[PDB]
Design brief:
homodimer; alpha/beta; Rossmann fold; eleven-stranded mixed beta sheet; 34% helix; 15% strand; cell membrane (chains A, B); serine esterase (chains A, B); signal (chains A, B)
Chain lengths: 527, 527
């Protein structure tokens, strides 16, 4: 039967799913690790014991335990990101969409969800792999991983909560694909990992980490990169936050053993309830439990790894959205609101810069302010709001990504760069937020193809192009079969991604990124 | 007789001079101080002993001893600034142009020459007062003052070379005008001092200095301001340079008395020959012997004087030229030459920034470079040359002047601001240098009115306007009789000065001047 697959872990029974008036197979909820529960909380994952019988893979699995956004109750703009299944610590499952009839050896794409390493679900509507699997004739995988404390609590030296265990979940899933995708018709020698935001930083982390490099062929990074200032912490900072978390829960802090024991007795929601209390600064775009530079998963600092070429050499396709910061300013900066135009005073602007660059001394805060202020028109509400939006986007997403691409391009075997600037016609978030962080994903997954979702015909066209680029890149290492130019060290070309005829440009946001990647870091080092 | 004037120092005999097909009186070479020679070298000036008989005032006097520019021997662009009379330490004389017939009580204008406090002559062709005196029916005075070591050697504490003595020359001349202009038909209650570059900084210094305020009514500052980074030095730096100068001349450096004695035996040219050897940095736009913050002429730091309003409150008219830096880069920066277009490499650009900001640490040099580099086009030769031109102009002239105007405007009784951007059609300096430092003076003095000098008709028109503005301002405190708006703290308006219909703008170079006046000084204070 087309819906029965015998893998090395046991047999699995899929379900036939309708897609744009045709059908494909879906194998949902395949376990790839032992449930990370009890004494196994904060531990490295453990491979799933093979099972006899037929695993029923016809429904989506639980989503990991995570903080749940209740900012706009009922609003679809925010709720589409919230878990849509029961949460459980028993959450380590993957999902496979397979063309029909079953291929013999095709391109595989593995999606790694974002959510700031504190949230995310493989089971979201915008992540439904059936459009891309069907359209591009790829085998589409989506994995899952522990988030928040469960995924990233770090007490370096201890084996009970080493840190990085959420990254090891992703790795075990990539191990299960390596070992089993062939039985689904996928080519394990032609896997692309792709992910957005923490998913893109994850993808870059598997390129860096020696124990992941061998488990995939190529990588796509959307609005994230491993060297992002929010994507990792020192072992000492990880340690300080695990201790503070236990402090919030009245744990015995005498030893790691005492701490870890106490944390393992607490219900998931107890951890989730005090999780934001451990941040060291009053900040925006900072997440409590994130990957640590442990000397294992990452042998050395990300930067020295990037300088020496200590990383998988392959092809990469990556890019950013126009207005990466608006979401974080909305949710966290004074003066921004969902239902106004959010024109920002100078007083709120300066409040915003302080939140966006928590680690900066006053001189550093002045350097930023001067770099983004139009002194001919410094009380312009719109210019203040947009300039803050760019600060957040630049510092947190664009310029880290630009640094990664430039460093990577020195040693890699082909780099394709995009700048996604189409604002979807049916976007429910206000205008001021622009081309919002995360809103290229629905184009990547082909939602503009389903009539009922209310996109224009030109949005459908753009979706079909993006998908064809991503899948052709996954297949050949080149998005091209008009032509998207290679990004090279000298010319530094990139394309815009929008409903208009392609335009090639060069040096994406160089003025600002020299400031964030060269000048400001020098400034804070000296002062 | 019209050409005979009985003053308080004795009688003086002028000479009738032709001017645009009419005539006026000129009293040239009037002494206003005792010759600063012998034991009086480096001393405060001494008022001129009255004389019996008739002083022959029919010829220009000697120019002070000064370094002589020999960069372009024969070239008129440079030689027009060189002394055109014999140099002598006996140089303290003024020149008066008086309408004919002799007025009874008219507006007086006193011109204070520039030349970086190391050079300058009252007797230059471009300073001929007869066009302005004739056209505007003003009494025009030009004074002189000691420059170089002779004017500005500073050994604070000693009375033999206190420093600032060149400023006291100007002051004695303003004292002689106060006391005697009435006999020439001038109103001593309606004197405007005006000057360009060191002449403009001088004018601002007489506004600041309590012992000068009472000797004039209003002030015009062209391309200079008292708080310019090259216009003054601490007493300690003045001291270090007088000692170094004596070191260059093998003086006994045991005491000030030994030093000063040794310096007074040297011929003028011996001092002039080693004068540039005392600068502390490899720099551009820095002059060895300049005014010192002595606690006498200037009671406190210029800045604390400007903050507290310790300064004459009156009306001021002031401004800058478009391309203030080009002359100093020409003469002193690698890669610029008179007969090429001077496209600058990045290597020369960075060499230029270091020379332009000698007092900056590496971080400071990076801050400058980032502020003036187009990172989308950083090897553009023209953009590098122009960006260096702006660095020099901004740091040295425009932004100091913008700081002075803003501070002054808080307490003053009316501020008129201009931006002079017409490049003269008959300019002999190359194109790349633009609207060159100093080239508004010939418009101020009405050279475009003499046919033989080869200006266009619209240049003559602009000259007539500038002159009418300067003289109407001198007369009433308002350049207006289309309308040049007052510069106010809020609106910060200014006009361009060119052959085109007037345009009012606001906040002259604010982006750059926040950087030079606020950010960079903070940067170097912290590092």
């Amino acid at each position: 039967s087309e819906l029965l697959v015998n893998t090395k872990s046991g047999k699995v029974m899929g379900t036939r799913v309708p897609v744009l008036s045709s059908h494909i197979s879906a194998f949902l909820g395949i376990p790839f690790a032992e449930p990370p529960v009890g004494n196994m909380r904060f531990r490295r994952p453990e491979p799933k014991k093979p099972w006899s019988g037929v695993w029923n893979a016809s429904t989506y699995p639980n989503n990991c335990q995570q903080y749940v956004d209740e900012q706009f109750p009922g609003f679809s703009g925010s709720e589409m990101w919230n878990p849509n299944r029961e949460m459980s610590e028993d959450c380590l499952y993957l999902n496979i969409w397979v063309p029909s009839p079953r291929p013999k050896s095709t391109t595989v794409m593995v999606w790694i969800y974002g959510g700031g390493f504190y949230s995310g679900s493989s089971t979201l509507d915008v992540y439904n792999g059936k459009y891309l699997a069907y359209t591009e004739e790829v085998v589409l995988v989506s994995l899952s991983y522990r988030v928040g404390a469960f995924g990233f609590l770090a007490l370096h030296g201890s084996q009970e909560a080493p840190g990085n265990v959420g990254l090891l979940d992703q790795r075990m899933a990539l191990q299960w694909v390596h070992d089993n995708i062939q039985f689904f018709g996928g080519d394990p020698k032609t896997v692309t990992i792709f992910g957005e935001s923490a998913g893109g930083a994850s993808v870059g982390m598997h390129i860096l980490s020696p124990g992941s490099r061998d488990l995939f062929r190529r990588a796509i990074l959307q609005s994230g990169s491993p060297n992002c200032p929010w994507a990792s912490v020192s072992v000492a900072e990880g340690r300080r936050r695990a201790v503070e978390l236990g402090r919030n829960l009245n744990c015995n802090l005498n030893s790691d053993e005492e701490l870890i024991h106490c944390l393992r007795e607490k219900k998931p929601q107890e951890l989730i309830d005090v999780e934001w209390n451990v941040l060291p600064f009053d900040s925006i775009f900072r997440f409590s439990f994130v990957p640590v530079i442990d000397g294992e998963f990452f042998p050395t600092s990300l930067e020295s790894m990037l300088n020496s070429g200590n990383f998988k050499k392959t092809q990469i396709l990556l890019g950013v959205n126009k207005d990466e910061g608006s979401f974080f300013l909305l949710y966290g900066a004074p003066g921004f609101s969902k239902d106004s135009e959010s024109k920002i005073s100078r007083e709120d602007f300066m409040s915003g810069v302080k939140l966006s660059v928590p680690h900066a001394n006053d001189l550093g805060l002045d350097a930023v302010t001067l770099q983004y202020t139009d002194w001919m028109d410094d009380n312009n509400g719109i210019k203040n709001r947009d300039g803050l939006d760019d600060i957040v986007g630049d510092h947190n997403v664009i310029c880290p990504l630009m640094h990664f691409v430039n460093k990577y391009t020195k040693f890699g075997n082909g780099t394709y760069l995009y700048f996604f600037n189409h604002r979807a016609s049916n976007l429910v978030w206000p205008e001021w937020m622009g081309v919002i962080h995360g809103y290229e994903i629905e184009f990547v997954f082909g939602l503009p193809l389903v009539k009922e979702l209310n996109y224009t015909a030109e949005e459908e066209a753009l979706s079909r192009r993006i998908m064809h680029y991503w899948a052709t890149f996954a297949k050949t290492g080149n998005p091209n079969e008009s032509k998207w130019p290679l990004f090279t060290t000298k010319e530094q070309k990139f394309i815009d991604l929008n409903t208009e005829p392609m335009k090639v440009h060069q040096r994406l946001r160089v003025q600002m990124c020299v400031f964030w990647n060269q000048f400001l870091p020098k400034l804070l080092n000296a002062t």
